[PDB]
């Protein structure tokens, strides 16, 4: 999943938990430190890259 534009579309209140809900499942992927043996290594990069974006898009809304 690569969300790119709808972040700019709608309100900022929801993206807080949208950040949170992503943040939680980041932990879920973070079980790999035990050799989680999770299939999608790129998910972390997918997770890590996108999480910053919404954490960046908020500035465009002059937070």
């Amino acid at each position: 999943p690569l969300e790119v534009d709808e972040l700019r579309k709608m309100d900022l209140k929801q993206l807080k938990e949208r950040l949170n809900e992503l943040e939680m499942q980041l932990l879920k992927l973070r079980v790999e430190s035990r050799m989680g043996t999770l299939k999608n290594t790129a998910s972390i990069k997918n997770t890590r890259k996108d999480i910053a974006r919404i954490l960046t898009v908020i500035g465009e809304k002059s937070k």
Binding site: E23, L27, R30, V31, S33, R34
Partner: peptide, 9 residues
């Protein structure tokens, strides 16, 4: 902020 769940023996 929480980062990982350690799973040592």
């Amino acid at each position: 902020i929480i980062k990982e769940f350690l799973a040592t023996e």
